[PDB]
Design a protein around this ligand. Structure first.
Ligand code: IHP
Ligand code: IHP
Ligand code: IHP
Lengths: 111, 116, 109
């Protein structure tokens, strides 16, 4: 029975999560399965998955993951992209797709 | 013998099996913990032979400490074991993991405070 | 029987790959398998395995692997070693064994 489908995002967080599209202009949208995947991934990399539960938990993860980005595989970048959106959701920063999330994260990063 | 378990000498296993995992708790360290730590090290692509010496463990802890604040329970357990393992090699008598960690940065403190 | 070996080295790079020896004065030499292995080794470490197809790709993987090298396991150093030779091949640097390859990588760094 239940797992990380309940501890990472709140109900309202969740309903905004399942409206965000994976690729800009695309058809497919984040589901619970991506959150489960990301949490199990974090522990397979020895990172604390509880950090997914808060906006700075993810801020910390993304800081630790980013230097691996250039050389990272498709798996790494998906994990990072998912955690970027989770950050957007925890911050209540409205996003339409993954791309807009990385954008807003860099804009917040420039100031 | 035992391949991964022999990082400790016969005498070191004797004090090893006396050190409590958590302070005031009664469960203690066993072979299963060293075997586990070794296997975890090579699962993080680190050389398990480093557990054989005080500075093998010194090097491992330095390589792991950056990952500690965001690390998972398995990484903190690994660090804690290697911390205790370092104190055993160093003949530093400790009673639980907390003591091992506490002395660990007394070492890491004086290293920096006479450097400065 | 799927490939993943013609993606990394060209046919002529392959002919020189297969003359490099694993160790100086040694008898054993690099083979296709060393590249298959290196490639899956990079996906298990979360790295993009396409970076092996270009010298620039390898140059970067080496940079991000070097820090782990002092405390790294036998498995890590063999990955690093294999990719160091891959680099010189891509770079048209001629080496006879893993040691020469590692040395030249050293002086570049
Ligand atoms: O993206 P919109 O142009 O805004 O239009 C709608 C809509 O938005 P409205 O609230 O204005 O009706 C719904 O979002 P919800 O009310 O359900 O929260 C939604 O409706 P249904 O899925 O129930 O049909 C659905 O898609 P989704 O929930 O998958 O985002 C869809 O968005 P799209 O127009 O992009 O399909
Ligand atoms: O004589 P030992 O066989 O070596 O056993 C004693 C002890 O009793 P004493 O007061 O007579 O010394 C405890 O036994 P327990 O009640 O806790 O169940 C304790 O035993 P533990 O091993 O379980 O802690 C401790 O044992 P040790 O230090 O070996 O871990 C210690 O042994 P030492 O006096 O030799 O240190
Ligand atoms: O045509 P061959 O005289 O038989 O030459 C080859 C070959 O040389 P070429 O393919 O270029 O002609 C290699 O030696 P090198 O050219 O690098 O010096 C080879 O060794 P490899 O397995 O690394 O290719 C080996 O010479 P060796 O006995 O040193 O291994 C071998 O000659 P043989 O097939 O007669 O052994």
């Amino acid at each position: 029975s239940m797992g990380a489908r309940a501890s990472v995002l709140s109900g309202g967080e969740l309903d905004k999560w399942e409206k965000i599209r994976l690729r800009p202009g695309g058809k497919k949208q984040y589901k619970l399965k991506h959150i489960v995947w990301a949490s199990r991934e974090l522990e397979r990399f020895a990172v604390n998955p509880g950090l997914l539960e808060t906006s700075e938990g993810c801020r910390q993860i993304l800081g630790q993951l980013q230097p691996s980005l250039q050389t990272g595989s498709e798996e790494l970048r998906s994990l990072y992209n998912t955690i970027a959106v989770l950050y957007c959701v925890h911050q209540r920063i409205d996003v339409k797709d993954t791309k807009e999330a990385l954008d807003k994260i860099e804009e917040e990063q420039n100031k």
